[PDB]
Amino acid sequence: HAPPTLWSRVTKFGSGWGFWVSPTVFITTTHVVPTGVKEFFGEPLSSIAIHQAGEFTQFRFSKKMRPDLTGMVLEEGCPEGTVCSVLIKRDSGELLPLAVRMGAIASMRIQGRLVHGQSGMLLLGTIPGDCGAPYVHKRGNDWVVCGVHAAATKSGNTVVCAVQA
Numbered sequence: 188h189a190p191p192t193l194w195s196r197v198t199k200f201g202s203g204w205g206f207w208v209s210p211t212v213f214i215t216t217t218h219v220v221p222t223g224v225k226e227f228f229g230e231p232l233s234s235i236a237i238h239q240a241g242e243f244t245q246f247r248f249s250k251k252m253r254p255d256l257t258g259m260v261l262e263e264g265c266p267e268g269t270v271c272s273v274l275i276k277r278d279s280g281e282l283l284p285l286a287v288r289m290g291a292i293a294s295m296r297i298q299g300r301l302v303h304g305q306s307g308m309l310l311l312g313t314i315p316g317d318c319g320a321p322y323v324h325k326r327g328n329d330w331v332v333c334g335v336h337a338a339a340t341k342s343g344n345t346v347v348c349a350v351q352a
């Protein structure tokens with residue numbers, strides 16, 4: 188059961204969503220980042236450190252954007268078989284945590300782009316608007332985030348999260 192504070196890290200961004208890993212670090216999927224804009228969350232692009240690879244994008248800000256938060260562990264994907272939750276927020280405001288059994292980390296070619304991703308089997312599916320929603324799982328006491336939603340098959344049964352380099 189994801190607690191409210193964890194949901195409150197999921198943030199509307201561009202054509203999808205992103206996730207506050209910490210008071211200063213925001214992650215999303217590269218292709219939802221809005222093109223040709225000059226500020227994010229009221230900060231000039233000059234003030235933001237941006238690291239982007241394989242459809243994973245990380246923003247690092249120069250001040251605490253979300254001081255109410257603590258830092259949580261960000262992993263490069265998770266072990267195969269791990270059951271994650273995709274913390275989906277819909278435009279209506281509905282919360283939709285989807286259980287996913289994760290498979291292998293792999294390079295993948297999706298609509299011609301290189302994705303450094305991890306596929307999973309949905310155990311209710313994902314829609315075009317859901318990209319950037321975090322894949323998390325609870326490690327003992329703490330929550331770990333390990334990817335951001337990037338793609339799904341036409342069936343919808345298989346989902347892909349982009350993961351850190």
Ligand SMILES: *[C@@H](O)[C@@H]1CCC(=O)NCCCn2cc(nn2)C[C@H](NC(=O)OCc2ccccc2)C(=O)N[C@@H](CC2CCCCC2)C(=O)N1
Pocket residue numbers: 203218242295296297298300302313314315316317318319336337338339340341342343347
């Ligand atoms: C968020 O931008 C959006 C999330 C889509 C979603 O979760 N469900 C929609 C299902 C409808 N749909 C879209 C597509 N297929 N079905 C196009 C892409 N899927 C695909 O090609 O799957 C084939 C595949 C799967 C695994 C490995 C190899 C091939 C798709 O989901 N595209 C994605 C946008 C691209 C854009 C460039 C970077 C990579 C993602 C998308 O629509 N995401």
